[PDB]
Amino acid sequence: RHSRLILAILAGLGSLLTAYLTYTKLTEQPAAFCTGDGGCDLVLSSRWAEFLGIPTAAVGLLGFLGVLALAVLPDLPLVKRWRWPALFGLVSAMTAFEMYMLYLMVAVLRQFCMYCTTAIILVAGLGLVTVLGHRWLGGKLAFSYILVAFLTLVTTIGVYANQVPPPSPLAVGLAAHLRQIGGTMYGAYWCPHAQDQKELFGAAFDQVPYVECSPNGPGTPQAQECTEAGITSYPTWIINGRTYTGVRSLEALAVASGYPLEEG
């Protein structure tokens, strides 16, 4: 009944899973077109999936390997004393992080991925076992959980807000300039690279002419307006008759739109 063997197994599965995703995220032949995703890459490769300069999966790797090591180590310095309180800290942080991950899928991304879902259940499995695999005689644990979860959520949310650069100085003027010449952006709301392009403008993207190519969602035939323009992939810029496909920096969009970049 009392066992840390299951922790090593669940953390073992977790370590393989999250290590494989790093490999897919790391090898990752780079692309912007994202022409073809049913799928899972649509949820996955969302910025949100990068954390502090490294893949989110690599963070879970530090975690899943962390919990594994605490379970495997024999009771050595500082282990018997700090083993189980450090397990409740690390796992609590992992559950909290996951509930935010779960929140992103259901609410903001409105989609799912089986790799990501398996990790939740693995961590939910870790949370149950850690609670029922040691004796700490009560209200301490319920409070220690909220403390760690709170610190985790604040740090997590804080990083994903400090993740994006705010409006570039060129951004504001360009957006108004494209609005005048009718430089339009064709893309989707689910499209991760459209989000990347959106984030390069910031709040100034309100000014940018944007056509939703698929209002109904993924898997559905794209809207008429985009089909008339021959849009095969997202995002796609049409500026002064010219066609530019993929994410473009503010500098490159300014060149296409004829927006003066003066430094003299």
Curated annotation (Swiss-Prot):
Effect of residue 44 to A/G: Reduces enzyme activity
Subcellular location per the Swiss-Prot or TrEMBL entry: Membrane
Site feature (Important for the reduction of the redox-active Cys-130 and Cys-133) residues: 34, 40, 191, 194
Outcome following mutation: residue 25 to A: Reduces enzyme activity by about 40% with dithiothreitol as in vitro reductant
Enzyme Commission code: 1.17.4.-
Record entry for activity regulation: Inhibited by ferulenol.
Cytoplasmic side: 72-85, 133-140
Membrane topology, record value: Multi-pass membrane protein
Disulfide bonds, paired cysteine numbers: 34-40, 113-116, 191-194, 213-226
SMART domains (UniProt xref): VKc
Effect of residue 25 to R: Minor effect on enzyme activity with dithiothreitol as in vitro reductant
Domain of life: Bacteria
Residues reported in the UniProt entry to bind a quinone: 43-49, 94-105
Effect the entry attributes to changing residue 116 to A: Abolishes enzyme activity, also with dithiothreitol as in vitro reductant
Membrane side Periplasmic: residue ranges: 26-50, 107-111, 162-264
Effect annotated for changing residue 40 to A: Abolishes enzyme activity, but not with dithiothreitol as in vitro reductant
Keyword field: Disulfide bond, Membrane, Oxidoreductase, Quinone, Redox-active center, Transmembrane, Transmembrane helix
GO MF annotations, alphabetized: oxidoreductase activity; quinone binding
Region (Thioredoxin-like domain): 168-264
Pfam family, one: VKOR
Enzyme class: oxidoreductase
Entry GO CC: membrane
Transmembrane regions: 5-25, 51-71, 86-106, 112-132, 141-161
Function, as annotated: Thiol-disulfide oxidoreductase that catalyzes vitamin K-dependent disulfide bond formation in periplasmic target proteins.
Family, as annotated: Belongs to the VKOR family.
Name of this protein: Vitamin K epoxide reductase homolog
Phylogenetic placement of the source organism: Bacteria, Bacillati, Cyanobacteriota, Cyanophyceae, Synechococcales
